Write a protein that binds this ligand. Structure first.
Ligand SMILES: [Zn+2]
Ligand SMILES: [Zn+2]
Length: 55
């Protein structure tokens, strides 16, 4: 049950045992649902919105 209360996603809500996905570039852990990813179609490579719009 580690990191249960840890907030890493941009939505400011904690892990809470919800499915997560890591940005391939900034290494931030984002909620799978916040990443707008359907559980039936999880990409090999995920890049968060912020990294996509870098600089
Ligand atoms: Zn989130
Ligand atoms: Zn990123």
């Amino acid at each position: 049950l580690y990191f249960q209360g840890l907030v890493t996603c941009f939505c400011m809500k904690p892990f809470a045992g919800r499915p997560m996905i890591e940005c391939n570039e900034c290494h931030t852990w984002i909620h799978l649902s916040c990443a707008k990813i359907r559980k039936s179609n999880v990409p090999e490579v995920f890049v968060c919105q912020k990294c996509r719009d870098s600089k």
